[PDB]
Amino acid sequence: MASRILLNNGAKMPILGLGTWKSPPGQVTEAVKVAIDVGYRHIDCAHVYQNENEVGVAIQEKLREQVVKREELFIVSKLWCTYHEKGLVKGACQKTLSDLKLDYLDLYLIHWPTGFKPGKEFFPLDESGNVVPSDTNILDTWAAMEELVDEGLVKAIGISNFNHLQVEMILNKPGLKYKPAVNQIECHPYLTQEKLIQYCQSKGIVVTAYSPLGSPDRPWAKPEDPSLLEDPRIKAIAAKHNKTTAQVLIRFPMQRNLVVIPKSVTPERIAENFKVFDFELSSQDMTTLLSYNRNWRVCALLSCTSHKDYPFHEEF
Numbered sequence: 434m435a436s437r438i439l440l441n442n443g444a445k446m447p448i449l450g451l452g453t454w455k456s457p458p459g460q461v462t463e464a465v466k467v468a469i470d471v472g473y474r475h476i477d478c479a480h481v482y483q484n485e486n487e488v489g490v491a492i493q494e495k496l497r498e499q500v501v502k503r504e505e506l507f508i509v510s511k512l513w514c515t516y517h518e519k520g521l522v523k524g525a526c527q528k529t530l531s532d533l534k535l536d537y538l539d540l541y542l543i544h545w546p547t548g549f550k551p552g553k554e555f556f557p558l559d560e561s562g563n564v565v566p567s568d569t570n571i572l573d574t575w576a577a578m579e580e581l582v583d584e585g586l587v588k589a590i591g592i593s594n595f596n597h598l599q600v601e602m603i604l605n606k607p608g609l610k611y612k613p614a615v616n617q618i619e620c621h622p623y624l625t626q627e628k629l630i631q632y633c634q635s636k637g638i639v640v641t642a643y644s645p646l647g648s649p650d651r652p653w654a655k656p657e658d659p660s661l662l663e664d665p666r667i668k669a670i671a672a673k674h675n676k677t678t679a680q681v682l683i684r685f686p687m688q689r690n691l692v693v694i695p696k697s698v699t700p701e702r703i704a705e706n707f708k709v710f711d712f713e714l715s716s717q718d719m720t721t722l723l724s725y726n727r728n729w730r731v732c733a734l735l736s737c738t739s740h741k742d743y744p745f746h747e748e749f
């Protein structure tokens with residue numbers, strides 16, 4: 434298994450990265466330091482995670498210690514929904530760069546296709562609990578992302594949580610300057626995304642799988658929800674390979690030519706999760722894992738379901 438995948442800008446993206454959603458500031462600096470020490474070179478960040486300063490601390494320390502050089506790292510961040518207005522995009526990117534202590538991002542994503550009312554609150558709600566949209570649209574936000582590439586702030590741009598019609602809208606823009614390099618989407622054995630992955634890969638867009646472990650730590654989890662990491666069928670596949678369930682869940686998307694970004698702040702798990710380049714899932718294992726699909730999505734938000742651009746009404 435080759436460790437990097439070629440993007441449309443000629444750059445190579447590591448297929449395994451470290452996720453940072455719900456990595457608390459008081460723990461994420463150590464997580465990123467350990468990750469770099471054990472071989473991670475891709476870190477998935479976002480302004481909405483409220484920890485970019487502490488991620489940046491770790492990166493800065495490992496650059497100063499001469500453990501890695503900047504060109505070897507692949508740092509991803511994302512434009513939050515309250516910054517979709519064309520006049521707000523650059524500032525949002527520069528805030529992320531300042532927090533991360535970087536002079537460029539390797540990849541910058543539109544975090545969701547939905548623009549929200551600008552302001553301090555990340556999730557601005559009306560008095561009845563509905564998200565308050567902004568009068569923004571995907572194509573104008575994309576054009577503002579393109580300017581970031583032209584100014585050297587980011588090397589590549591992409592999208593996240595876009596359905597295929599939303600991807601198509603960008604692809605079909607006449608004066609398109611840059612195609613999206615990546616679509617980052619939820620993907621795991623309970624949400625295998627066959628149709629959207631086929632679509633994106635057919636269009637030369639690399640897919641990154643988020644929540645590959647099923648995001649057990651997500652704040653809206655209900656005790657009756659399915660649990661990937663505790664699924665005895667997946668456990669049995671892992672035992673056959675003398676691997677952990679998490680290792681199987683990370684290797685699975687890798688064998689579908691996806692990038693994958695498992696999150697941990699636990700040093701032993703950060704190290705375990707990287708040890709996925711030394712075994713292979715069989716054809717039968719892959720078929721079995723794909724067969725667990727239930728179209729079950731962990732990242733969904735009821736308050737956002739009436740937004741005009743909410744992505745999950747479409748089949749894919």
Ligand SMILES: NC(=O)c1ccc[n+]([C@@H]2O[C@H](COP(=O)([O-])OP(=O)(O)OC[C@H]3O[C@@H](n4cnc5c(N)ncnc54)[C@H](OP(=O)(O)O)[C@@H]3O)[C@@H](O)[C@H]2O)c1
Pocket residue numbers: 451452453454455477478544593594617618642643644645646647648649650662677679680694695696697698699702703705706732
């Ligand atoms: N673009 C988007 O809209 C979007 C949405 C969701 C996620 N993401 C990105 O994708 C990343 C990954 O998704 P996620 O954070 O939702 O969840 P995940 O990676 O599926 O699961 C993370 C959870 O698994 C635990 N864990 C990690 N390794 C483990 C192991 N070896 N054994 C047992 N438990 C283990 C973690 O615990 P500890 O940390 O306590 O060890 C944490 O509770 C995010 O952090 C974020 O970077 C992006």
Ligand SMILES: O=C1C[C@@]2(C(=O)N1)C(=O)N(Cc1ccc(Br)cc1F)C(=O)c1ccc(F)cc12
Pocket residue numbers: 454455481482483544545547732733734737
């Ligand atoms: O990595 C992540 C997890 C994520 C996130 O955004 N990126 C997340 O999917 N959701 C759910 C969500 C947000 C916005 C829209 Br639109 C739909 C939706 F399902 C959240 O509410 C959320 C809340 C605070 C976060 F720091 C991260 C999230």
